Design an enzyme around this catalytic site. Structure first.
Site, mmCIF file in Angstrom:
data_model
loop_
_atom_site.group_PDB
_atom_site.id
_atom_site.type_symbol
_atom_site.label_atom_id
_atom_site.label_comp_id
_atom_site.label_asym_id
_atom_site.label_seq_id
_atom_site.Cartn_x
_atom_site.Cartn_y
_atom_site.Cartn_z
ATOM 1 N N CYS A 30 2.377 -0.536 -26.121
ATOM 2 C CA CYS A 30 2.266 -1.011 -24.179
ATOM 3 C C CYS A 30 1.565 -0.253 -23.441
ATOM 4 O O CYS A 30 1.825 0.836 -23.239
ATOM 5 C CB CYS A 30 4.051 -0.994 -24.540
ATOM 6 S SG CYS A 30 4.545 -0.799 -22.896
ATOM 7 N N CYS A 33 4.034 1.263 -20.720
ATOM 8 C CA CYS A 33 4.375 2.521 -21.303
ATOM 9 C C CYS A 33 3.327 3.576 -21.887
ATOM 10 O O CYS A 33 3.572 4.794 -20.970
ATOM 11 C CB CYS A 33 5.066 2.343 -22.690
ATOM 12 S SG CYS A 33 5.806 0.712 -23.245
#
Length: 106
Positions: A30, A33
């Site tokens: 991700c 993230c």
């Protein structure tokens, strides 16, 4: 100043804690993230006196994400004592994270 959580240590360090705990559910694949990762670290030092910052990788630790019905990442769960008091899904600026925490601490 970051608490690396796992499926085995989560209940001991978040649920059983009396204080306030910010948990960042994240994963390497991700990119949002990763984008907020330096922000989370700065907040950990900045708000050190007020709360505890923790991260949980959902690839390595899938059970806690499942139990709380986390749909996307990054998801930020703000715990007070053992219960969730606020949620923020998706990437966010440092200013937005500051405003979010101040709203529930200050």
């Amino acid at each position: 100043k970051i608490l690396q959580l796992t499926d085995d240590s989560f209940e001991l360090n978040v649920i059983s804690a009396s204080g306030v705990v910010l948990v960042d559910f994240w994963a390497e694949w991700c990119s949002p993230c990763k984008s907020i990762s330096p922000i989370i670290d700065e907040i950990s030092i900045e708000y050190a006196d007020k709360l505890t910052v923790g991260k949980l990788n959902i690839d390595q630790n899938p059970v806690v994400p499942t139990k709380y019905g986390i749909r996307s990442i990054p998801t930020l769960l703000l715990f007070k004592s053992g219960e969730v008091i606020a949620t923020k899904v998706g990437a966010l600026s440092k200013a937005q994270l500051r405003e979010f925490l101040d709203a529930y601490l200050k």
